Ligand binder design. Structure first.
Ligand SMILES: CC[C@H](C)[C@H](NC(C)=O)C(=O)N[C@H]1CCCCC/C=C\[C@@H]2C[C@@]2(C(=O)NS(=O)(=O)C2(C)CC2)NC(=O)[C@@H]2C[C@@H](Oc3nc4cc(OC)ccc4nc3C)CN2C1=O
Ligand SMILES: [Zn+2]
Length: 197
C-alpha cells in the first residue's frame, strides 16, 4: 500500500504544424523533460496548433483539438491525466467502447471545426507530418489511396482525418493490416465526438 505507485500524466512533446503551405512536425520537449513533466503533471510550455504530439513514459501518439476538447485514443492515454501549467488535468471524456478520451483543450491551442460537408475525400495527418489521402468507406473506416506498411502509421493514433476544407472528420484509431500493409484505417467519426460532448 505504501508501495503503490501512480501513473504519470500524458505530456505534450510537440505538434504537427499545419500553419503554412508545408506540414511539418515540431518537437517542443525532450525525453528527460517529458519524464520529469509526466511525474509532476506541471507543464509550463506554451501550446500551439491543432495537432499535438503526446507521450507517456512508454508510448507516444497524437492528440487533436476539436470544439475546445483535446481528443486522443484510450489505448494510448488510458485514464491518465494530462500535464498542464497548474498541474495534472483530469479527463472530461472517457469512452473505452469508442477507444476515445478527451481533456479540455490546452490554453493557446487552436481547435478544428467539426465537418458538416458530407464529403468522402479525406486526409489523414500522421506524426511525421504526412498528409495521406484517404477515401471514406463507412461511418468509421476509410481506405488509403496509396497503401503503405503499417510502420508509417504507428504512433499516429489520435491524429485527425480532415475534409478538403480542413474540417475535422474523425480521430485516427486503428489500421487495417493485410500482410503488414495498411490498406484501410478506422477512426472515431466527429459525430461520435459531437455526441459524447
Ligand atoms: C480495428 C481493429 C482492426 C480489426 C485491425 N485488424 C487487423 C487484422 O489489422 C487491428 O487490430 N489493427 C491494429 C494493428 C496494430 C499494428 C500497428 C497499426 C499502426 C498504426 C495505428 C493507428 C494505431 C496506432 O498508431 N496506435 S499507437 O499510436 O502507435 C499506440 C499503441 C501508442 C498508442 N492504432 C492501434 O495500433 C490500435 C490499438 C489497438 O486497437 C484498439 N485497441 C483498444 C484498447 C482499449 O483499451 C485498452 C479500448 C478500445 C480499443 N480499440 C482498438 C481498435 C491495435 N491497433 C491496430 O491498429
Ligand atoms: Zn468539411
Amino acid at each position: 500500500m505504501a508501495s503503490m505507485k501512480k501513473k504519470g500524466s500524458v505530456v505534450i512533446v510537440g505538434r504537427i504544424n499545419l500553419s503554412g503551405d508545408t506540414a511539418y512536425a515540431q518537437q517542443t520537449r525532450g525525453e528527460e523533460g517529458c519524464q520529469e513533466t509526466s511525474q509532476t503533471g506541471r507543464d509550463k510550455n506554451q501550446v500551439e496548433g491543432e495537432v499535438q504530439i503526446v507521450s507517456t513514459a512508454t508510448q507516444t501518439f497524437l492528440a487533436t483539438s476539436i470544439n475546445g476538447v483535446l481528443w486522443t485514443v484510450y489505448h494510448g492515454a488510458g485514464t491518465r491525466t494530462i500535464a498542464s501549467p497548474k498541474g495534472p488535468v483530469t479527463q472530461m471524456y472517457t469512452n473505452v467502447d469508442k477507444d476515445l478520451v478527451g481533456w479540455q483543450a490546452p490554453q493557446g491551442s487552436r481547435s478544428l471545426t467539426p465537418c458538416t460537408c458530407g464529403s468522402s475525400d479525406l486526409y489523414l495527418v500522421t506524426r511525421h507530418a504526412d498528409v495521406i489521402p484517404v477515401r471514406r468507406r463507412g461511418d468509421s473506416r476509410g481506405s488509403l489511396l496509396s497503401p503503405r506498411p503499417i510502420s508509417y502509421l504507428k504512433g499516429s493514433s489520435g491524429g485527425p482525418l480532415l475534409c478538403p476544407a480542413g474540417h475535422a472528420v474523425g480521430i485516427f484509431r486503428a489500421a487495417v493490416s493485410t500482410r503488414g500493409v495498411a490498406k484501410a484505417v478506422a477512426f472515431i467519426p466527429v459525430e461520435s465526438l459531437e455526441t459524447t460532448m
